[PDB]
Design a protein around this ligand. Sequence first.
Ligand SMILES: [Mg+2]
Ligand SMILES: [Mg+2]
Ligand SMILES: [Mg+2]
Ligand SMILES: [Mg+2]
Ligand SMILES: [Mg+2]
Ligand SMILES: [Mg+2]
Ligand SMILES: [Mg+2]
Ligand SMILES: [Mg+2]
Ligand SMILES: [Mg+2]
Ligand SMILES: [Mg+2]
Ligand SMILES: [Mg+2]
Ligand SMILES: [Mg+2]
Ligand SMILES: [Mg+2]
Ligand SMILES: [Mg+2]
Ligand SMILES: [Mg+2]
Ligand SMILES: [Mg+2]
Ligand SMILES: [Mg+2]
Ligand SMILES: [Mg+2]
Ligand SMILES: [Mg+2]
Ligand SMILES: [Mg+2]
Ligand SMILES: [Mg+2]
Ligand SMILES: [Mg+2]
Ligand SMILES: [Mg+2]
Ligand SMILES: [Mg+2]
Ligand SMILES: [Mg+2]
Ligand SMILES: [Mg+2]
Ligand SMILES: [Mg+2]
Ligand SMILES: [Mg+2]
Ligand SMILES: [Mg+2]
Ligand SMILES: [Mg+2]
Ligand SMILES: [Mg+2]
Ligand SMILES: [Mg+2]
Ligand SMILES: [Mg+2]
Ligand SMILES: [Mg+2]
Ligand SMILES: [Mg+2]
Ligand SMILES: [Mg+2]
Ligand SMILES: [Mg+2]
Ligand SMILES: [Mg+2]
Ligand SMILES: [Mg+2]
Ligand SMILES: [Mg+2]
Ligand SMILES: [Mg+2]
Ligand SMILES: [Mg+2]
Ligand SMILES: [Mg+2]
Ligand SMILES: [Mg+2]
Ligand SMILES: [Mg+2]
Ligand SMILES: [Mg+2]
Ligand SMILES: [Mg+2]
Ligand SMILES: [Mg+2]
Ligand SMILES: [Mg+2]
Ligand SMILES: [Mg+2]
Ligand SMILES: [Mg+2]
Ligand SMILES: [Mg+2]
Ligand SMILES: [Mg+2]
Ligand SMILES: [Mg+2]
Ligand SMILES: [Mg+2]
Ligand SMILES: [Mg+2]
Ligand SMILES: [Mg+2]
Ligand SMILES: [Mg+2]
Ligand SMILES: [Mg+2]
Ligand SMILES: [Mg+2]
Ligand SMILES: [Mg+2]
Ligand SMILES: [Mg+2]
Ligand SMILES: [Mg+2]
Ligand SMILES: [Mg+2]
Ligand SMILES: [Mg+2]
Ligand SMILES: [Mg+2]
Ligand SMILES: [Mg+2]
Ligand SMILES: [Mg+2]
Ligand SMILES: [Mg+2]
Ligand SMILES: [Mg+2]
Ligand SMILES: [Mg+2]
Ligand SMILES: [Mg+2]
Ligand SMILES: [Mg+2]
Ligand SMILES: [Mg+2]
Ligand SMILES: [Mg+2]
Ligand SMILES: [Mg+2]
Ligand SMILES: [Mg+2]
Ligand SMILES: [Mg+2]
Ligand SMILES: [Mg+2]
Ligand SMILES: [Mg+2]
Ligand SMILES: [Mg+2]
Ligand SMILES: [Mg+2]
Ligand SMILES: [Mg+2]
Ligand SMILES: [Mg+2]
Lengths: 54, 114, 119, 209, 123
Amino acid sequence: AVQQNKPTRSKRGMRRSHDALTAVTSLSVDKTSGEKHLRHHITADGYYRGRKVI
Amino acid sequence: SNIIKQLEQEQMKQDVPSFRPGDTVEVKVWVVEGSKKRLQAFEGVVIAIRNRGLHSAFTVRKISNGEGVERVFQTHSPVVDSISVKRRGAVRKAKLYYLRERTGKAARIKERLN
Amino acid sequence: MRHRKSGRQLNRNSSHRQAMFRNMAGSLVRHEIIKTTLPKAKELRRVVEPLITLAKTDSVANRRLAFARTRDNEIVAKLFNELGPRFASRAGGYTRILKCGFRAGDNAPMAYIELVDRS
Amino acid sequence: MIGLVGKKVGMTRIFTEDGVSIPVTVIEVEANRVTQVKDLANDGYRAIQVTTGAKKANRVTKPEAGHFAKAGVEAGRGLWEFRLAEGEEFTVGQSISVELFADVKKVDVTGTSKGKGFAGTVKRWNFRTQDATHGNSLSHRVPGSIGQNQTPGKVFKGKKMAGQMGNERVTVQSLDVVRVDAERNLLLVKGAVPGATGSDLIVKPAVKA
Amino acid sequence: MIQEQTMLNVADNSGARRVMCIKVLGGSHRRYAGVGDIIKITIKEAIPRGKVKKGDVLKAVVVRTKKGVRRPDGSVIRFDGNACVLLNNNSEQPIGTRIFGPVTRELRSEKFMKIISLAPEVL
RNA sequence: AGGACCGAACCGACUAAUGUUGAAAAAUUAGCGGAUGACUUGUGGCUGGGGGUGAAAGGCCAAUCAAACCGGGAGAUAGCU
RNA sequence: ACACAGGUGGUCAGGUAGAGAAUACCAAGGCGCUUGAGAGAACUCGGGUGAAGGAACUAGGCAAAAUGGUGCCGUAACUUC
RNA sequence: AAUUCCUUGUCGGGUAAGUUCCGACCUGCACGAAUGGCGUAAUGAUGGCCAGGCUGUCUCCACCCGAGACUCAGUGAAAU
RNA sequence: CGAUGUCGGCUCAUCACAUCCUGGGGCUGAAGUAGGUCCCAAGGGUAUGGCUGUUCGCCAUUUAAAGUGGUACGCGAGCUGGGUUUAGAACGUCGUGAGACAGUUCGGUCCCUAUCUGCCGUGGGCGCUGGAGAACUGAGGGGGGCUGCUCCUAGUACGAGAGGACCGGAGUGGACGCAUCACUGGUGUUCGGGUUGUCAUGCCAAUGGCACUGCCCGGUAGCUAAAUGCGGAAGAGAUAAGUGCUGAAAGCAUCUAAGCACGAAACUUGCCCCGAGAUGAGUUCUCCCUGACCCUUUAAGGGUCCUGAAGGAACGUUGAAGACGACGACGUUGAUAGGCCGGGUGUGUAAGCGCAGCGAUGCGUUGAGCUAACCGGUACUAAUGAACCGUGAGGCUUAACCU
Ligand SMILES: [Mg+2]
Ligand SMILES: [Mg+2]
Ligand SMILES: [Mg+2]
Ligand SMILES: [Mg+2]
Ligand SMILES: [Mg+2]
Ligand SMILES: [Mg+2]
Ligand SMILES: [Mg+2]
Ligand SMILES: [Mg+2]
Ligand SMILES: [Mg+2]
Ligand SMILES: [Mg+2]
Ligand SMILES: [Mg+2]
Ligand SMILES: [Mg+2]
Ligand SMILES: [Mg+2]
Ligand SMILES: [Mg+2]
Ligand SMILES: [Mg+2]
Ligand SMILES: [Mg+2]
Ligand SMILES: [Mg+2]
Ligand SMILES: [Mg+2]
Ligand SMILES: [Mg+2]
Ligand SMILES: [Mg+2]
Ligand SMILES: [Mg+2]
Ligand SMILES: [Mg+2]
Ligand SMILES: [Mg+2]
Ligand SMILES: [Mg+2]
Ligand SMILES: [Mg+2]
Ligand SMILES: [Mg+2]
Ligand SMILES: [Mg+2]
Ligand SMILES: [Mg+2]
Ligand SMILES: [Mg+2]
Ligand SMILES: [Mg+2]
Ligand SMILES: [Mg+2]
Ligand SMILES: [Mg+2]
Ligand SMILES: [Mg+2]
Ligand SMILES: [Mg+2]
Ligand SMILES: [Mg+2]
Ligand SMILES: [Mg+2]
Ligand SMILES: [Mg+2]
Ligand SMILES: [Mg+2]
Ligand SMILES: [Mg+2]
Ligand SMILES: [Mg+2]
Ligand SMILES: [Mg+2]
Ligand SMILES: [Mg+2]
Ligand SMILES: [Mg+2]
Ligand SMILES: [Mg+2]
Ligand SMILES: [Mg+2]
Ligand SMILES: [Mg+2]
Ligand SMILES: [Mg+2]
Ligand SMILES: [Mg+2]
Ligand SMILES: [Mg+2]
Ligand SMILES: [Mg+2]
Ligand SMILES: [Mg+2]
Ligand SMILES: [Mg+2]
Ligand SMILES: [Mg+2]
Ligand SMILES: [Mg+2]
Ligand SMILES: [Mg+2]
Ligand SMILES: [Mg+2]
Ligand SMILES: [Mg+2]
Ligand SMILES: [Mg+2]
Ligand SMILES: [Mg+2]
Ligand SMILES: [Mg+2]
Ligand SMILES: [Mg+2]
Ligand SMILES: [Mg+2]
Ligand SMILES: [Mg+2]
Ligand SMILES: [Mg+2]
Ligand SMILES: [Mg+2]
Ligand SMILES: [Mg+2]
Ligand SMILES: [Mg+2]
Ligand SMILES: [Mg+2]
Ligand SMILES: [Mg+2]
Ligand SMILES: [Mg+2]
Ligand SMILES: [Mg+2]
Ligand SMILES: [Mg+2]
Ligand SMILES: [Mg+2]
Ligand SMILES: [Mg+2]
Ligand SMILES: [Mg+2]
Ligand SMILES: [Mg+2]
Ligand SMILES: [Mg+2]
Ligand SMILES: [Mg+2]
Ligand SMILES: [Mg+2]
Ligand SMILES: [Mg+2]
Ligand SMILES: [Mg+2]
Ligand SMILES: [Mg+2]
Ligand SMILES: [Mg+2]
Ligand SMILES: [Mg+2]
């Protein structure tokens, strides 16, 4: 099963339109550390909801 | 459920005896031959028991006229009136399905003395 | 199909999944905190918390069963000595899952699973 | 006729003195309250909408809260609608009960079935399967052919193949009612109703009987 | 659940012991035969001197089934073998004068009153 | 003792399935036959193209054989595309 | 042609079972075979089980399923014995 | 008949039913005696038929265990 | 012919009517059942086996009936390779011979990850003229439409008799589909137990690993069929063949030219489902922000500050929802998931101890121990305070009303 006519750049772009990326809606800030981390995840130092775990 | 467990108790029978698998059991079953009702006796070994509450059942196997017959009875069904134990046996299982490929002097169960 | 079922294959057979979970539970008991993928950290709770409730009642049969499950005397001894009285007041909840982020080699989610009474 | 909305709880059996174990699917039909009555003058038809159950005050939205407050009804878990016939009238604040089916013998039950996901042709349309041996290769459960060669040379619309099977609204008619418990708000219907336990079902009087 | 090519024992004393079912009566695409369902069989193993011989084709009824019958209350009555009773192609009446083994109450009818009476036990 | 038997190494490839822009330009798994003899294998040598060899299939002769490969006649000829 | 599921001659031969270099588990010793994680649709491949019938499927018992070892009684037609 | 177009030649056996199988009839299109004929103990990864057991081959499929297929991160072709 | 792959078989169907059954009717040398012929009618259904590679065909037994043909003698980028049709070999025949035989016999590689149309299903964007959350009207489209047997009517009508009714009701079943797991069973390599070989835990005991889940015995939930509930309609409108009423052209007659009525599983509704992108973009109950500034291009204009609502989106716990999307429930004002308590179910008297027996082993503690997906509860843990998107009263013309 192979193609019979060469597709176009328009069709290629239409197909790739749904292949885009979605960025992060917003970031979270720790109450005491003031950093920026992902939602429900820990920071790069070991802070989560103000407490220290590392 | 909290409603199923209440709807399945208004029909459950409280006069059910305790019988283990592999014991000689007597069952009286209602039979309606036309317009009159009578009782029929079914005596045999219990090779399987399935406890599910109202949906509980037990199997009885017996040799009749040279042919083996197995029959499942619903424990809490009004068609069954009396269940009695004539001889209690000792087995190390709960499903005696090896009594179907075996008959005669090899299919004798011991007696449980308690 | 998968309806009302439980358990996760994790692209492994039973003989591999049981051994991996046993090793992970032993490491978690030994170190009080480990880092692993989120599904593994979630499935390890169902193996470790019953193992802690078993140690909550000290006896010979319980220790024998724990040894059968873990194959680590140095782990079962600690589980029955320290974790037992430590979690004797908690009605479950012997683990705490904290998301770590992702990974470089496969970009899989990562998380730290530890004991609630660690620090 | 005016139907009601209930919640499926499970299947069980009921014994009769004759020695019959009738299957039954218990349906819990709580006090079904009225939310709005639609007349022929404004909406163009005679109907009535019904609310069942209760919902969180922190979860019910403001438009729903206002719509319920217009009638004077607590926030339920959904809204259904039933058409009306001649001689049938209601108000906005009524709360119908399960006693409406006291003199009803056969009912129709409508509900969403259980989703089986993306199912194969054999499971979806009761197709047959080719031989698993004698030389077969990679075509043990395939549907096979779909059309004819270059006449028409396409695929007819409505062909039976793989796809979604379940999660759809199905109606089973002429189910016999066994018992009505007004105190416990329970309806006993013989047979099997579509949908798993906890689903919402619509029970109506039989349209044909 | 009796179908074609099924091997059955014989309950009556017409001179047959092993029979093979070839058709099931009742309609089109009829594949399963329970108790009281008329089928057609051929004779594969027969006694030397009996009312029938080997190779005969005739109707029969099912009195025992390993699959078993199902009572309305759910009580299923099974057996340990599949046995049948011979009949006549025209009159559909039994040939032998005895019925070995027990039978089931789901068989009694105006057409089979001569089987339950001869059976030593009825379930 | 046996061109004896069952059955491993070893040799071979009868059936099925996978694969067939394959892990592989003939393989993999489950089975299979011979397996002390007309057996198999290592090393070395010899037999060559109208010729060699061939328990003989038009089979093999360096993944190519109803006449091997390289160079030359040669830009053979082509009423053919 | 590849860090290729292929081919390549000789030697050493451990333990428990076991007739044995077959097979299972192991010691000395060597490896997890250079992309992983996640959910657990149709469908493909390697498999396991199965209510009653048991070749009715099919060109065809193809495939699949089934016995399968030691000791002992005993074993037909036919025969170049 | 490994040979017979007419042919599914006729009879018998097996099957409830047998253009396949076996034993006979000979009307051998077009067997035949060392480009050998008849039979034949043992043997065949040989051709055909029947039987016992055996089973998802099927009646009619159902569930489960793993590898792919599905999503994410990286590398990244092809026939046309 | 710089390739359109071929007979038969399996799965998959679709259309047609010169119809096999069901439906209605006319004639009959149609007394009745059962029949023969013809007209209308395609809504539904239309068999299993032995032989052969075979379609076809013969036979056995059913069926209400076992239709005729087209679709590249339908369908090999769906399957099969039995035959036909390559290279091997043989028989019969011909040819002195290499060889030939739609004469026969044994064996003999069927590749393709779908680019476009099509189809089965699931989504993102935008629009429907302020936005958002819900319930619907239903233009239109799709699914189904089959029938046997027994009894009553009635051994009545009919017939000198065997024989045996039309119409109309009741009941039970076969094939088909939808739904479900309460019951009957399968699976259940996540539960329990028996047992063989071997290794290991310092050793006995007790366990773990491997040998298809090592081989097995039962089995929770879930999924299932062989299991159990349901459906095929009743009825209405307009009709074909057909039967008619009144009634002239044609003083009669005449179903028709005016007019009226009956009439089939054919058609539209009626039963179920999808469904306003039905751009002709629909209807209804609700909710939401009623702040100021300047600039040329004077307008459906551009920009600034403040404001960020209803609601939605995102992350997380997740689901009897699901390929990814999507949908549903919950998120500290909470039972959403995990864990825990109790119960239930399943497996089947756990380990240890003591006693009896030289011993294997049995007995009491003990229906004990264990118990996945089940139920009723429990915040013990994880679902965070936030942030983001989405705005700030909604164009022109005309008709009615109020100013
Ligand atoms: Mg082209
Ligand atoms: Mg894309
Ligand atoms: Mg769950
Ligand atoms: Mg993977
Ligand atoms: Mg294993
Ligand atoms: Mg689902
Ligand atoms: Mg089939
Ligand atoms: Mg092949
Ligand atoms: Mg295959
Ligand atoms: Mg192939
Ligand atoms: Mg094609
Ligand atoms: Mg030899
Ligand atoms: Mg060779
Ligand atoms: Mg070969
Ligand atoms: Mg091999
Ligand atoms: Mg071999
Ligand atoms: Mg040998
Ligand atoms: Mg050499
Ligand atoms: Mg040469
Ligand atoms: Mg030369
Ligand atoms: Mg040749
Ligand atoms: Mg070569
Ligand atoms: Mg060659
Ligand atoms: Mg030459
Ligand atoms: Mg020259
Ligand atoms: Mg040239
Ligand atoms: Mg490599
Ligand atoms: Mg290599
Ligand atoms: Mg050794
Ligand atoms: Mg799978
Ligand atoms: Mg198997
Ligand atoms: Mg087995
Ligand atoms: Mg089976
Ligand atoms: Mg079993
Ligand atoms: Mg069986
Ligand atoms: Mg058999
Ligand atoms: Mg056959
Ligand atoms: Mg056939
Ligand atoms: Mg075989
Ligand atoms: Mg001869
Ligand atoms: Mg011939
Ligand atoms: Mg003959
Ligand atoms: Mg002959
Ligand atoms: Mg001659
Ligand atoms: Mg000759
Ligand atoms: Mg001659
Ligand atoms: Mg001579
Ligand atoms: Mg000669
Ligand atoms: Mg010769
Ligand atoms: Mg056989
Ligand atoms: Mg992918
Ligand atoms: Mg390229
Ligand atoms: Mg051509
Ligand atoms: Mg071309
Ligand atoms: Mg060709
Ligand atoms: Mg016609
Ligand atoms: Mg039509
Ligand atoms: Mg119609
Ligand atoms: Mg046969
Ligand atoms: Mg064709
Ligand atoms: Mg073809
Ligand atoms: Mg094509
Ligand atoms: Mg061939
Ligand atoms: Mg030819
Ligand atoms: Mg000729
Ligand atoms: Mg494909
Ligand atoms: Mg959309
Ligand atoms: Mg069930
Ligand atoms: Mg249950
Ligand atoms: Mg079971
Ligand atoms: Mg099992
Ligand atoms: Mg089950
Ligand atoms: Mg062991
Ligand atoms: Mg020991
Ligand atoms: Mg090991
Ligand atoms: Mg007149
Ligand atoms: Mg007139
Ligand atoms: Mg009808
Ligand atoms: Mg219990
Ligand atoms: Mg004991
Ligand atoms: Mg134990
Ligand atoms: Mg004990
Ligand atoms: Mg006791
Ligand atoms: Mg418990």
